[PDB]
């Protein structure tokens, strides 16, 4: 989509966080903003850069 | 650096120069596959969240 991912007002997902919910990629290599729910969404591992 | 600026709120004498070197963080230690620390880790994102 060219995004980190946006969920819809349903719940709808997009971008890298949908694709590593339906498992498509194993990873999601990007400079993710580590949020609040997007630890809800998938786990995280440390950030590499603070 | 903490330890530091407890110390400068009743310490005007001295000044503290420059900023920190290194990023090195103190976190709550937890046992190995303790179930409840999602529980901790939602909580404090929700927390500083809140500030």
């Known amino acids: 989509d060219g995004k980190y991912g946006a969920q819809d007002d349903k719940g709808q997902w997009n971008g890298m966080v949908k694709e590593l919910i339906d498992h498509k990629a194993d990873l999601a290599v ?15 591992s440390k950030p590499f850069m603070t | 650096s903490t330890t530091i600026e407890y110390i ?36 404090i994102l929700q927390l500083q969240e809140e500030d």
């Open chain 1, 30 to 44: 990007a400079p993710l903003t580590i949020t609040h729910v997007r630890e809800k969404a998938i786990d995280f």
């Open chain 2, 8 to 43: 400068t709120q009743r310490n005007c004498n001295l000044t503290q120069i420059g900023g920190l070197i290194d990023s090195k963080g103190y976190g709550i230690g937890t046992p190995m596959g303790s179930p409840y620390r999602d529980k901790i880790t939602i909580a």
